[PDB]
Amino acid sequence: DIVMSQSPSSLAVSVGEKVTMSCKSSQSLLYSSNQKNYLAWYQQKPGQSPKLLIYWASTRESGVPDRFTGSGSGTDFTLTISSVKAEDLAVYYCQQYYSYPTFGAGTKLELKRTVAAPSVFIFPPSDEQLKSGTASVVCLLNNFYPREAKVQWKVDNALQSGNSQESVTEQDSKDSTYSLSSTLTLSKADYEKHKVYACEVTHQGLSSPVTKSFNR
Amino acid sequence: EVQLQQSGPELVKPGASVKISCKASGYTFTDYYMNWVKQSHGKSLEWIGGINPNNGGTSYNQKFKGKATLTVDKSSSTAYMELRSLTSEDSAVYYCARNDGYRGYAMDYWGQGTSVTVSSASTKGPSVFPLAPSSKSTSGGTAALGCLVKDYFPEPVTVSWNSGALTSGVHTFPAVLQSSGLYSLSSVVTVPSSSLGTQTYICNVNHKPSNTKVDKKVEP
Numbered sequence: 001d002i003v004m005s006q007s008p009s010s011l012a013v014s015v016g017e018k019v020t021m022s023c024k025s026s027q028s029l030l031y032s033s034n035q036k037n038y039l040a041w042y043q044q045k046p047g048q049s050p051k052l053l054i055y056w057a058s059t060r061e062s063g064v065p066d067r068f069t070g071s072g073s074g075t076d077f078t079l080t081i082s083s084v085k086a087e088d089l090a091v092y093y094c095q096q097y098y099s100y101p102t103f104g105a106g107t108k109l110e111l112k113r114t115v116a117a118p119s120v121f122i123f124p125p126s127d128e129q130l131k132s133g134t135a136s137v138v139c140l141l142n143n144f145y146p147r148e149a150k151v152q153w154k155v156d157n158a159l160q161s162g163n164s165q166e167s168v169t170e171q172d173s174k175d176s177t178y179s180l181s182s183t184l185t186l187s188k189a190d191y192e193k194h195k196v197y198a199c200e201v202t203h204q205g206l207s208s209p210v211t212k213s214f215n216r
Numbered sequence: 217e218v219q220l221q222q223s224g225p226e227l228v229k230p231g232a233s234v235k236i237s238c239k240a241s242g243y244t245f246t247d248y249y250m251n252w253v254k255q256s257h258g259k260s261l262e263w264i265g266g267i268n269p270n271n272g273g274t275s276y277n278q279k280f281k282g283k284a285t286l287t288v289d290k291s292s293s294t295a296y297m298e299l300r301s302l303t304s305e306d307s308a309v310y311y312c313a314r315n316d317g318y319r320g321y322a323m324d325y326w327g328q329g330t331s332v333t334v335s336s337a338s339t340k341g342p343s344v345f346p347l348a349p350s351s352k353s354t355s356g357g358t359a360a361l362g363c364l365v366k367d368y369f370p371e372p373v374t375v376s377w378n379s380g381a382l383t384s385g386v387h388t389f390p391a392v393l394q395s396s397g398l399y400s401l402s403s404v405v406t407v408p409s410s411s412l413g414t415q416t417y418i419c420n421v422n423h424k425p426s427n428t429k430v431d432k433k434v435e436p
Contacts, residue, residue, distance in 0.1 A: 040322040042261075049311050049329055050253075050261060055322040093261060097321035100277065101251075101263040119406070121353040121360040129345045129366070138347060140360055140404055142387065167389040167401065179387040181402045183364075185394075214352045 002027045002102050004094055010108035015176075019081040021107040023094035028074045029057070031098070038098035041070060041079050044106075045090045046170035053092075054079070086111055087173045111176040117205030118144035118180070120212040122198075125191065135191035139199035139212070141180035143172070150202035151182045154211075156194045160184065192216065218242030220312050220327040225425045227339050227370055228302055228332070235287075235298040236330050238312035243325075245269055245293040251313040251323055252286065252297045264310070267295060268317055299332075307334045333370035333425075340398060341428030342368035344421045347404060349436045354409055361434045362404035363419030367396070373423040375403035380420075412436055 003026040013019050029038045037057030042050035052061045054070035057077055069080045079092060091106040123138035141149055147168060153160045164184040171178060182199065198213030223236040240250070251266040265276035269290035276284065283306060287296040299306055312327030347362035365373055375388045388403035403419065417434040 038320055042323075049326040050313075050323075051326070052322060052324045055324075061324055091260075095261075095263075095321075100275070101321045103261045103263070106260045119355045119360070121355070121404075122350075123347045123353065123362075123364075124350070126345045126348065126364075129343070129364075132343070134366075136345070136364060136366065136400075138362075138364065138402060140353075140362075140387075140402075142360060142404075142406055165392040165394065165400075167392050169387055169389055179389070179404070181387075181389045181404070183392070183400065183402070212352055214350065 002096050002099065004096055004102050004104035006092075006094055006104035006107050008107060009105060010110060012110040012112045013084050014112040015084055015086050017084050017112075019084055019109065020078055021092060022076065022078045023072070023104050025075050025077070025096055027096075027098065029096055029098040030074050037073060037077075038096060039072075039077055040095050040097065041068075042093045042095065043090045044093065045087075045173070050093060084111070086176055089171050089173060089176075111171055113145050113176040115205040116143060116145045116175075116177055118142060118149060118201065118203055118210075120199060120201055120210050122212045122214055124214065125188075130188050130191065133188050134185065135188045136183055136185040137197055139182035139184070141182070141201065143175065143177040143179060144203055144205055145177050146204065147178050148204070149178075149180055151180065152200040152202075153182070153184045154196070154198045154200055156196040218314075218325050220314060220325055222312050222327040222330045225331045225370070225372065226333070227425045228334055230302060230304070230334055230336055232302055233298055233300045234302065234332065235296055236310060236332070237294055237296055238327055239292065239294045240312075240314060241293065243314075245290055247317075249315050249317040249321075250288070250295045251315055251321065252284070252295075253311045253313050253323075253326075254280075254308050255311065255329070256308040259308075263321070264297070266315070266321065269295075302334045304334050306332065308332060331370075331372050335370060337369055339426035340367065340369045341426040342366060342373060342421065342423050344419065344430040344432045346419075346432055346434040347402065349407075349412060349434070357409050358406055359409045359412060360404055360406040361417060362402055363421065363432055363434060364400070364402055365421055365423075366400045367394075367398045368400070368423050368426070368428075369398050370425060371399060373401070373421055375401075376420040377405060378416075378418060378420075
């Protein structure tokens with residue numbers, strides 16, 4: 001029954017900066033016979049299984065770059081990254097194995113970059129779909145930063161509400177941006193009751209809201 | 217070279233059981249214990265228990281002993297985990313994780329996860345629809361196209377383009393949950409309005425729990 005507590009729960013950083021997360025353990029993790037610390041660091045990039053960075057608290061697993069250094073003894077530890085790459089975005093877990101394995105909450109590593117403005121697109125409902133009674137129109141906000149981005153669908157200059165669902169990707173591992181898919185779905189019979197189908201976009205990398213639209 | 221391969225997506229009915237597998241390949245399976253770690257969505261890791269091949273000796277997480285049973289089969293270098301009296305709390309991702317017993321539970325090689333969903337519902341294949349590359353779908357001479365993957369249950373599907381030949385600028389979004397209770401995602405890709413004339417774009421959707429397979433074409 002050991003409690004692993006990592007602070008901070010999350011942080012941001014520019015490529016090149018230095019990162020330092022810690023991991024207090026409620027119980028001392030040091031073995032008098034070993035003088036080895038029973039703590040490991042794992043990394044987990046979006047959509048992937050946890051990959052081992054460091055064991056014995058200090059020792060790198062092979063193939064793990066010199067930028068990650070393990071530090072700490074007894075109850076207090078710290079993972080360090082010397083020159084944050086844009087690819088290091090992940091959730092870092094400390095685990096103890098001084099007894100039955102327990103994890104920390106994780107520390108989410110976000111990357112910091114400049115305002116990028118989003119590229120707006122828009123998609124008609126396909127034939128094969130409309131030919132099934134349904135009608136989904138789609139808005140694609142490609143490659144912006146930060147993650148806040150408002151997206152109002154409008155139909156014939158009538159603001160909708162309750163008929164669309166947004167989805168945000170995780171940060172790109174090269175450009176550090178985001179993509180955002182905004183699907184508007186209604187009945188084919190509601191589809192062919194109007195003409196104007198637009199997608200009004202607010203953001204920070206935009207000065208004036210960007211509308212993209214099309215006609216049935 | 218050291219590969220850990222687990223089963224596929226499981227759709228199981230509340231109260232049933234499930235056994236997911238893990239064939240380990242690339243090392244001598246018998247001088248390495250083998251762990252299983254739960255991962256609920258947007259939540260951290262949870263060790264379940266771990267077993268050595270040499271006698272099938274176990275040790276369990278003190279809250280999983282009553283849900284999880286670990287069975288080994290060195291003769292096939294496969295480990296097993298079974299989950300019983302299933303509820304929705306056991307809907308998550310479970311990884312196979314290898315460790316050395318002689319040193320402790322540092323798991324250097326992990327599986328690839330198997331999404332487990334516990335629903336009263338039957339699987340339902342998705343309706344692969346294409347996303348139309350138009351001229352309002354353009355900015356700077358480059359066009360964005362895709363495939364909508366609508367109305368599937370349960371998570372997850374796997375989207376890839378040109379059978380993997382194409383990884384550049386692809387965006388396969390997290391699935392959203394509709395009013396109807398069926399997932400729906402997109403997996404766009406931005407591309408030059410040049411290739412459109414003379415280049416083909418095929419989404420390779422695979423929703424495995426329903427054995428569904430589609431390679432729909434995305435044209436202007």
